[PDB]
Amino acid sequence: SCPSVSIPSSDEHREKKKRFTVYKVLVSVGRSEWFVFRRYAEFDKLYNTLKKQFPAMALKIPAKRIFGDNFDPDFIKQRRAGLNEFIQNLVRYPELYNHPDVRAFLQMDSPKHQ
């Protein structure tokens, strides 16, 4: 079927002198569903790759460079919203959800999903 996606939540991880937010993406294709876990940088690489290959789609992603606390929960919430709208637009077009970089991002061809 035509895939459906959402980004319901995010989680903070830390290592030493370091933190990062991990976005939980629910991906549904047909009668099945799974979880993909993506950092903003992973959305961004995809956005940059596809904005060049599909200019007229006027792809939009939330801001990359933040002047302020990039771990403000208000900020992360707005960012998640923007990323959700980003990917949810991606899966509307078969030109996109048959794109290899998109299918890998959402793990649409992993053998683990049967």
Author numbering: 6 to 119
What does the publication say?
We have also obtained two crystal structures of SGK3 and SNX23 (for which previous structures exist), as well as a crystal structure of SNX15, the crystal structure of SNX32 (in complex with a peptide from the bacterial IncE peptide) and the NMR structure of SNX25. The remaining PX domains all bind to a broader range of di- and tri-phosphorylated phosphoinositides. These interactions are shown to arise from the presence of a secondary binding site, centered on a semi-conserved His or Tyr side chain in the α1 helix, associated with nearby positively charged basic side-chains. Interestingly, many of these PX domains show a substantial preference for PtdIns(3,4)P2 (e.g., SNX1, SNX2, SNX22, SGK3, and p47phox), although the functional role of this is not yet clear from our work. When the secondary site is present with an intact canonical binding site then both PtdIns3P and other phosphoinositides can promote membrane association, which will likely contribute to overall membrane avidity.
The Phox homology (PX) domain was first identified in the NADPH phagocyte oxidase complex subunits p40phox and p47phox, and has since been found in proteins in every eukaryotic species from yeast to human. Despite relatively low overall sequence homology, PX domains all possess the same core fold, consisting of three antiparallel β-strands (β1-β3), followed by three α-helices (α1–α3). An extended sequence traverses the protein between helices α1 and α2, termed the PPK loop as it generally contains a conserved ΨPxxPxK motif (Ψ = large aliphatic amino acids V, I, L, and M). Side chains of residues from the β3 strand, α1 helix and PPK loop together form a binding pocket for the headgroup of the canonical lipid PtdIns3P.
